[PDB]
Amino acid sequence: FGDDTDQEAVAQMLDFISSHTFVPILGIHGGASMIMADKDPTSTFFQFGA
Amino acid sequence: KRHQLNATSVTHKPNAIQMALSVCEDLISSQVYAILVSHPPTPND
Numbered sequence: 091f092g093d094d095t096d097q098e099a100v101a102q103m104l105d106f107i108s109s110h111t112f113v114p115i116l117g118i119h120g121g122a123s124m125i126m127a128d129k130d131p132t133s134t135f136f137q138f139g140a
Numbered sequence: 141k142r143h144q145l146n147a148t149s150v151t152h153k154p155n156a157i158q159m160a161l162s163v164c165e166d167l168i169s170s171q172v173y174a175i176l177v178s179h180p181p182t183p184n185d
């Protein structure tokens with residue numbers, strides 16, 4: 091996943107999706123690249139941020 | 141009556157993705173100002 095918006099919450103949504111769909115998701119740019127504190131243990135969401 | 145304030149509600153959905161889809165689809169479309177959320181009787185974290 092890679093977006094252009096600066097909205098942080100989008101990243102959160104991706105993690106939630108990874109919690110339910112059990113599909114790996116990679117952040118690239120924009121909101122997705124924003125690093126969240128702690129993801130759900132079931133979620134398999136990864137990001138390129140720091 | 142204490143002192144122009146509508147209200148809407150919906151039950152919990154079995155699927156979290158379906159619950160989120162219903163949420164905005166119904167709650168957001170009505171342009172609400174806040175959402176009241178409570179845990180179901182089932183013991184799901």
Ligand SMILES: *[C@@H]1O[C@H](CO)[C@@H](O)[C@H](O)[C@H]1NC(C)=O
Binds near residue numbers: 146147148
């Ligand atoms: C108040 O909310 C209810 C909830 O379904 C909705 O049906 C109704 O249209 C709302 N009132 C008005 C006049 O918008």
